[PDB]
Amino acid sequence: PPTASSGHGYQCHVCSAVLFSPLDLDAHVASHGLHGADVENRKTAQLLHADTPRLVTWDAGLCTSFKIVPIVPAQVPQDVLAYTFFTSSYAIQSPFPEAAVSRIVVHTRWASNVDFDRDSSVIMAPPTENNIHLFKQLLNTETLSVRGANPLMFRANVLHMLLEFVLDNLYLNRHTGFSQDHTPFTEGANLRSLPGPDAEKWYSIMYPTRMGTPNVSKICNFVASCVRNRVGRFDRAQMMNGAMSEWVDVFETSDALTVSIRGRWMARLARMNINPTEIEWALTECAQGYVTVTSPYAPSVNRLMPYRISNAERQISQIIRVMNIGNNATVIQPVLQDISVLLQRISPLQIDPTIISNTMSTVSESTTQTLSPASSILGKLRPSNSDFSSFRVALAGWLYNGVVTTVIDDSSYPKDGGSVTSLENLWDFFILALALPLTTDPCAPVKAFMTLANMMVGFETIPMDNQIYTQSRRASAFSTPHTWPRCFMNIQLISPIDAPILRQWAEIIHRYWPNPSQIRYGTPNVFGSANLFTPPEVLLLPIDHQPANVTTPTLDFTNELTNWRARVCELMKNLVDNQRYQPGWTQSLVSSMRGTLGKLKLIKSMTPMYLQQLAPVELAVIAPMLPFPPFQVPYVRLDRDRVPTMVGVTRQSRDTITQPALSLSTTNTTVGVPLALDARAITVALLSGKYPPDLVTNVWYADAIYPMYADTEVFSNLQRDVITCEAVQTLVTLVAQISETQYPVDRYLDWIPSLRASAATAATFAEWVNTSMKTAFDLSDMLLEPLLSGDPRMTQLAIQYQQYNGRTFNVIPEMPGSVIADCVQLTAEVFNHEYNLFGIARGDIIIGRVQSTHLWSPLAPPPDLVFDRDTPGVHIFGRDCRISFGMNGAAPMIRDETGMMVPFEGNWIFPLALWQMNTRYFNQQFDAWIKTGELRIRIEMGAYPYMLHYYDPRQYANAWNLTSAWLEEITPTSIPSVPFMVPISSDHDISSAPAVQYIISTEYNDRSLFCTNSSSPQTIAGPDKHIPVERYNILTNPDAPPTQIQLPEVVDLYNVVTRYAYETPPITAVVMGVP
C-alpha cells in the first residue's frame, strides 16, 4: 500500500547522515548499495507436504521370534550318574538350554541387530511368571485388579497383539559376511558372522548340527540323526569381481512364520522397483524436452528404489485428500498461492502497465468538454504493478475446479445498477466482459449477459422467469444453473425491434465465447494417474491451445482471446452509436469514444498470444511435480444441461446395503469452496503484456525449468500413498474380525470370547490400530483419521459429481491387496494351531478334586476325568439358576436348566458369565463342597491365559491354596490367570508322594513343552518329551527338499533364509541432469 514512515530511526552509516525513520533508512542504504496450530494448520501442512514413511530397513541378526528358555534347572550333580557323563562338566556349550524342563516362548526380534527399530514388540515372560498384562491393554480400562483381565476382550487384545507381531517384523534380511570352518566339525562350511559385541555365543545357536556327539543324552541323540551337509551358505550370486555378492541362501536357525512374513515384504518391495533408465525417461517426458537427464550404461550393482505404484492407490489417496479439503477455503488457498509463485518464477511474460498509458495519451479530444473517456478508463483501470497475482491465481485455479471455483468479486460490479448513459458503468461493463472468460465459474456467461441487462433498464426490456430475479436484480446473484433466464436460452424472446443491442450481445456470447481444450501432461509409466474423472494424462483448459511455430515470438492478432476483445469493442461501438441511449452527448464526444474504443481493440499486448501458446505448456510442465495433483471436471462451454452442480465423496455405507454403486447416492458429502478475484487486476494483466527484448523460448525454459526437476521430492509421496492404502485395508480386515461388515473376510479366531461391539468399541479399536501403525513407519501427521470420524465398520471409498440433468458420474476405485493384512491373516491362521506358544489355552477347565500319586500333567489329563454336554448324568445350568436353602438337615438344592433341582454333588456345567454374575453368592455355597465333598464343575470359557507351578513329586503337595485364590477373585468384569500344578521330570527313579489337583484342562494344551531332562539319557518319572523332530523337518528328513515349509500347523524353527546386499541410494545420486 501507500505506506509512509514516522519518527524513530536515524543512522545512515555510509555517509554520516540522520534520516526520518528506519524505513527511510533502509530504502536509503538500499539505494547506496544499488547505485555505486489448529487442525486447519495441520491439514494445510499435510497437503503441502506429508511425512514419508520408513519402507526399507535392514536386519543383521538371525530372523526369528521364538526362543527357548529353561524353566527348571537340571540335576547335574546327582548320586546315580557321575558328573563326568554330562557335557556341562566339560564346558561344552550346546545349542539348546540344558535344563530339566525347557519350553518355547515368544520374544519378537530377540536375536536381531536392526537398523531402525519399529517400537512394536510382543515380549513374553516364561509361563512360570505372569503374562496377564499382554491381554488387558485395549478396552480393559476399568478392571480394578492389577493381575486381572476381562474375558470379553481377549479377541480384540489378541488381534492387536498379532498386528504388533507383524509390524515388528517388517525388516529386510541383511548380508553380513562369512568365514570358513577350520575345524573338522563340518566339511569346510561357510559360517555367517553376525555383528555385535559378544559374537562367540551365536555360532552354537545358529548351527545346531556342529556340536560333537559324545553322549547318549537327548541333545546328542538328536544331533546324531541330522543331515551333515545342510549348514551355512550353499548358494550365492557373485555378479561382480570382489563386490559383495548380491544375495545368498544360508541354512540357520529361524522360524517359518517370520521368514514368510519377511519374504512377503520383500516380494511387495520388489514390485515397486524402478531403474535409472525408466526414471530418466519419465523425467524427460514430464519436462517435455526442455530438461535432459542422463543415466549410466554399465553392469549395475542391484540398486533397490521402490517408487512405482498402481493407479488405484493414487486414486484412493486423491479421494482422501479431497475429503480432507472439502468446504474450507483456507486449506486449499496456499496451494494456489505457491503455484502462482512458481508461475512467476518460470513464466517469461511480464506485465508492464505503461502500454495502456502510452496508448491512451495519444487520444485526440477537446478541452472545452466535461467528459473524457481516456481519463475515465485510466481512473477505472488504474494500471499499477502492485498485485497482478490475481492473474496467476486465476491461471492456477484451472487445475482445480472440482474443489475450487474462482468467481469475480461483487466489488467489481457497477454498485446497484449502472446505466448505459454513465461512462463509468460503460467501462465497468468492458472490464467485466474481458475478465469473466478467465474464471472457472460455470455461470460467467450469464453473469456477463445480465451485467449488460441490468446496466440498460428503461432503455430495453426482456421477459424474466419470475418477479424475484427481475431484470433490475443485481447481476452477481445469477450464480446457479437454475437461475439462467429463459430468454437467454430461447433467443427469439429478445426481439430486435425492442432489444436490438441486447439480442446482439446474446448472439455474441453464444457464438464467440472461448472454447475448452487440453494439453496432455505427465507420464503414467513410473507415476500413476491421480485424476478421477478425466482420462489419464489429460489436462483440461478453459481456452483453446495450439502450439507455437517459432521460438522467437513476435506479435500477432490471430487468436481467440483477441477476437473476443474485438467483438466486445465492436458491440460497445454499436452501443455508443445511437442517440437513443445517450441523448445528451455531442458529436465530439461520440467521435472521441469511437477513437478510444477503436484504439483499445488493437492494443499491442502479448498476453492473449501467451495464453494461447505458452501458458498451457507451463502448466503441463509444472503439474507432474505438484504435491497435490490436479482435480478437474469438464468445462462445459455454454450448455446449461451439463453444468456440474455438485461433487461429493462417501466414506461409509448407509444401511443393509453392501454395494457402493447403490449406497453412494445418499451417503456423500459435497466438496467445494469459491474464491473471489479482481476483474480490474485480471483485465489490466490481460491488456498489458510484453516479452523480454529478444527471448528465445527454448533457452529460457531450458534454464528456468532445471531446478524444479533437479529437486526430487515427488518420488517420496508415492510411498506415502502406498502406506495410506495399506492402512485402510488393514483397518477393514481387522474390524471385520470383531464386527459384522460387508466384505468377504476370513475368520479364524471365533473361538476366543468377545463382547458385542458397538460404534464406540469399533471406533476405539480403529484408533488403536491407527496409532500402532503410525508408531511403526515413523509417522507424525494424520493417517486413517479422515475415516475415523464416522462408523468404521461400514467403510467404503467413492466419489462422484452430478450435472444439471441429474445424470451422475461415479468413480469406485478398486481396492488392491495389502501385504500387511495378508500377513496378519497368516499370523492368525498360524495362531489357530500354535496358540499355546503365545500363552493361550483352548477349551475349558474342570474344577474338582483328584488325589493320587500319579504324574500325569494337568495340561494333558487322562480321558476318564473330563465330561461334556452329551454325557449321562450331567446337569447343565444357566438360564434361571436359583438356590434353595436346606432345612432340618435336608441338603440345599440348585435349579437345573430344565426346571429340576439337585443337591450339591456330581458333574455340573457352568457358563463363566453365570459364575461371574454371582461370584460371591456361589463361593460361599459351593467352595466347601468342592474342597472336601464330591462336587465337580466344568466352567466353560473357550480361551484363557494360564500360569504354571512346578513341584517336587516326592513331597506332599496340595493345590487348594492356588485354586481358591482364583475362584474367590473371579469377578463380574475380570478373571486372573488359571494356575496349574505341573510335576518335575526325573531322569532316575524316585519315590512317590500324594498330590491333590483341583484344576485340569479338557484338551491337550501342553504344546510349548520343548524337552524334558535334555541332558540326561532318559526321563523315567514325569512328562517326558524328546526334541520335536517335526519342528526340524529339513534337517532330519533327508528326502524333504531344503525349501519346504509346513506353515499352518508347524513353525519349523530352522530352515533356509535368503539374505540381500542391495543398496538404496537417492535418485539424484544415479540420475544426473545436464546443466
Binding site: 448472439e507 457464438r511 472454447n515 487440453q518 496432455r520 478425466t534 482420462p535 489419464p536 494424462e537 489429460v538 483440461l540 483453446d544 469438464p634
Partner: protein, 53 residues
C-alpha cells in the same frame, strides 16, 4: 495421427439475419466447429483416443 482443423463448408453475407426463411448453416460457417484426426488404421485412432478427451 494427423490433426487438421475443418473449416467453413458455408459462408455468411450481410443480409443474412437469422430469418425464418434463411437457409440453416449448421454451425459450419464459423472458424472452428470440429477437429479431424486422420490416420491409416482405426486401431491406431482408437488407441489415440485413450489419452484424449
Amino acid at each position: 495421427v494427423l490433426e487438421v482443423a475443418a473449416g467453413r463448408k458455408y459462408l455468411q453475407m450481410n443480409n443474412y439475419s437469422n430469418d425464418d426463411d434463411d437457409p440453416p448453416l449448421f454451425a459450419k460457417d464459423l472458424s472452428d466447429y470440429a477437429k479431424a484426426f486422420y490416420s491409416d488404421t482405426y486401431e491406431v485412432l482408437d488407441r489415440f483416443f485413450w489419452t484424449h478427451d
